[PDB]
Amino acid sequence: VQLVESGGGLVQPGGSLRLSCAASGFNIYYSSIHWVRQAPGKGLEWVASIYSYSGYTSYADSVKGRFTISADTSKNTAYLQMNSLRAEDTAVYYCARSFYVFKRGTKYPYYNYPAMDYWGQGTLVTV
C-alpha cells in the first residue's frame, strides 16, 4: 500500500525526464494510476492517468499529446516520460492509486466514481 516516487531535480527547458512511482502491496496490471501536479505556491491539477490493464493513457488537455506515460507490471511500477518541457511544468508531482467501491445487481446500482486513497511522497521538478 506504498507508492514511492523518484527522479527529482532541475532540467533545462525543452529537455526530457523520467518519473517512476514504485507500488507495493497491490498489482498494477488490473489497477489504475494517476499523476497530478502542484505548482509552487499554487493549486493542484490533474496531469495524466494510466489504466494499465488495457494500456490506456489519458493526458490533461493543457498537456495533451506532449507527455508519455505507461506502466511496468514486471516491476509493478508506473513510469512517466516527460517530454517537450515547458516553463510552466516545474511543480511537485504526485503518484496516486485510484479506487472505487461498487455493488452490481440492483435496479439502481450503487457505483462510486474513482477517487485517490494512496498518494506518492512527491517529486520536485524544476525548469
Partner: peptide, 27 residues
C-alpha cells in the same frame, strides 16, 4: 457531476490525503 466529488486534505509538508470520497462516505 452526480456524487463523484471528493474532499482531500493536504498539509504543506505532507503528501495530501483522502478525507471523503463520493461526498457521503467517510474514508
Amino acid at each position: 457531476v452526480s456524487s463523484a466529488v471528493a474532499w482531500y486534505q493536504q498539509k504543506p509538508g505532507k503528501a495530501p490525503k483522502l478525507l471523503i470520497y463520493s461526498a457521503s462516505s467517510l474514508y
